[PDB]
Design a protein around this ligand. Sequence first.
Ligand SMILES: [Mg+2]
Length: 864
Amino acid sequence: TKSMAKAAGVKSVFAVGNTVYMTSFGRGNDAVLEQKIVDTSHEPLNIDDPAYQLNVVTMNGYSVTGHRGETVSAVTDNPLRRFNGRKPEQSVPTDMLCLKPTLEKKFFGKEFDDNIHIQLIYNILDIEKILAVYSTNAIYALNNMSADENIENSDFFMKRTTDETFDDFEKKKESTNSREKADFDAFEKFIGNYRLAYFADAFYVNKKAKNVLREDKELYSVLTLIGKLAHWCVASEEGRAEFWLYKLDELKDDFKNVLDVVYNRPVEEINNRFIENNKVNIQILGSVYKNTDIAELVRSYYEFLITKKYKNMGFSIKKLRESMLEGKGYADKEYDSVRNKLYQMTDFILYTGYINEDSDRADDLVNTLRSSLKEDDKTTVYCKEADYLWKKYRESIREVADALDGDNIKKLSKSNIEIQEDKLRKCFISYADSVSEFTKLIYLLTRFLSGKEINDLVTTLINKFDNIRSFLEIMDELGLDRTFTAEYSFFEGSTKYLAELVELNSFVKSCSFDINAKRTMYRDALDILGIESDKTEEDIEKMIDNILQIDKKLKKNNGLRNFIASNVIDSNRFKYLVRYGNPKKIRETAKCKPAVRFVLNEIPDAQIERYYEACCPCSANKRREKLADMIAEIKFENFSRTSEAEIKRKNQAIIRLYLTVMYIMLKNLVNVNARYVIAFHCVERDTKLYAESGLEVGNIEKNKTNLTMAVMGVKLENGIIKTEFDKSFAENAANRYLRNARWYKLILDNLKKSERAVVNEFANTVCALNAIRNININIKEIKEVENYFALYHYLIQKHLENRFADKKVERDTGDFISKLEEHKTYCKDFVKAYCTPFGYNLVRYKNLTIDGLFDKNYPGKDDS
RNA sequence: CACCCGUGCAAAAAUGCAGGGGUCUAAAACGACCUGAAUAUUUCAGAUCAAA
RNA sequence: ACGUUUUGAUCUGAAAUAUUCAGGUCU
Ligand SMILES: [Mg+2]
């Protein structure tokens, strides 16, 4: 649960050399430091405004007392006495991988004698553990635009590298090699693909406006640049290529020129056509003010609208105007085509209220709101304040409202601008020249993934570049060494990368479809749904032609031909699934009932009661299985009369829930796969780390378990392990995880029964995503799925035994395929056998092999 | 309902007590004023669509 | 042949709720 230290105000307890600093929470997540402690003699910094006083300063515990919030007193622990409790009891603590000195020399110049540096090293390593989950399912989406309906095992995107340009990859067209030629033919297949129009914000250039493809010069410049990033988050790539993203200024002329255009077209759409796109709105606001100048009006309207600097004021204007407009004249039925613009002009006029005129009323209001004894005062603090405020603005928003009828907005929208402002151009969100190549690269990463996880990419990169900056204002405040090595100096600019990415968070939206892609989006509807036609592929797009017949002039009374052109093309959930899953594969993925019936457990109770009532004319256990076997056998007509029409209505009303079960299932089986992408990156990362720590590891591309042996001193000698157990190995392991005997023991037990060859397949199964990229074959017999750890591993234990269906395997592994198939669930002992390569890191090894310990949200029970 | 660490206690190898951990995993950070983003419902208005 | 009235769907706009990620404040 809670930790009473950080509830008492102690941020972190740094230890340098002999003394022990101790920090606290600044404004936000920057660190002010409270007091150093040389032993039992504390010198307090930060004299005025203390965050906590210290009571009993022992040799081991630092009992503090804090007065932020309700005043709690907690005891912290001496970092110098860590690992030295029962033995001279004063030393700096190394990290539990016992790789702290190598990590310090590798990023900075030399070793150190603190732990302020190594808490910063584990936040520079950490932006691979949160960028391999958002760069894998952005390359899973691109691998499902092949639509191969087969065993898919290609390697197109991880083959890509920015070591070559386009013009020499162009020379692989007429190439002579039997594998280089196929890759350009794999590229010819991909630029001639029509499903690139799904990602039109990064593949289409605006040139009314008729946007078309990029050149082959630049489509290669996105697929390579998004392909190198996925290959960098899965593997080692010794040399400068390991330091790839940390020097993105080393890219060629092409890749900056594609980052400088994929970033400009949303930032020039929002600046170069701002007054044009708000011309109907600025002219209202000029008419209601008439005393300010319109050049600074569109400045303070721009800070209100999109930049959103000064919009946070501690009181919700979106609730404030509604207590103002409760029961007033603007709740009519006529204003409903106006409330898009009426409610944001009304909101803006209050925003200029609480800046220019009565800004002193706002601080009165915020201080009022922090004294809520109940909630009922809040609905009469605003309504009391709106009772004042409508007396001020009722003439003004009437002048707005009568100027917003059905035809004034037509005649206002046809005027010439002639506003010619340069006070506005100061506060523009800046273009692609004064923003870095990192921000432009993780911009282009957010052009391939959904809106729930743009907001988790470019806010966990707000946080990590702010928890790197805050350490660089402690060890720079304490005079410690800070200069990174010159081949790694990316993070001096983490003060401005925090400033670029906050600017990036202000305007990123989802990757917009284009208009002229209905015809290929409609084709990828009927094979999600299984409405296949017996005619050939070159003779069914004319069906797609004559139903759409362009944007939409669909025929009248055409039945299900134009049902699935009106609703399920323009629906939200379909736009998520066809950018994500394989189109012509995920109907027969949905045919397994117990995988589906699992997935709508964590689909909410208010969600299923919308669809149970849409299909049945009552308990949520048996309500869910009533329509889990309706999503599975969905049925549509091929390409009495009451029953055969009402079964269509119960198949057309489940079509949104079907289309979101196959999204949540087909996503969460690669958020689980990205746990093993992290692990197989953090094994090839620790190979070049432990090999420089004087630990003779050896090769790892032949055998992935070589690190977790060479950490624990065990070796093969004739093809298997004949170095069995005693006590003296556990004291000589090169890791603080493998010190204790039983955790050394059972990893040694599991390592002796895991062959080399099945791990090398499990290597390029989680990295090229082949466990789920052809999921429909691998899921065909489930007896029961209880959690996504089980559903992932049965999908990965079949893919082994699908390939080890002819090859010779030894008896220890060959038990597990029999244990896989005498049941139909996954084999809980086989799942720990090939998960060993990342078994040197014990807490990664336990949390990635037993469900219950796997998931943050779903805690369970250990194995023992 | 994890792993490591420290102190306290019984014991010889581990468990109890309360802790701490950004240097433990994907995972350091109370609470209540908001903001940005999207989830999912409900109500209203609207425009298409299917069927009766 | 041609218009209905309903029902059930999508979507867009507004409001209400709950969840999640992040930072803006404050004690
Ligand atoms: Mg960490």
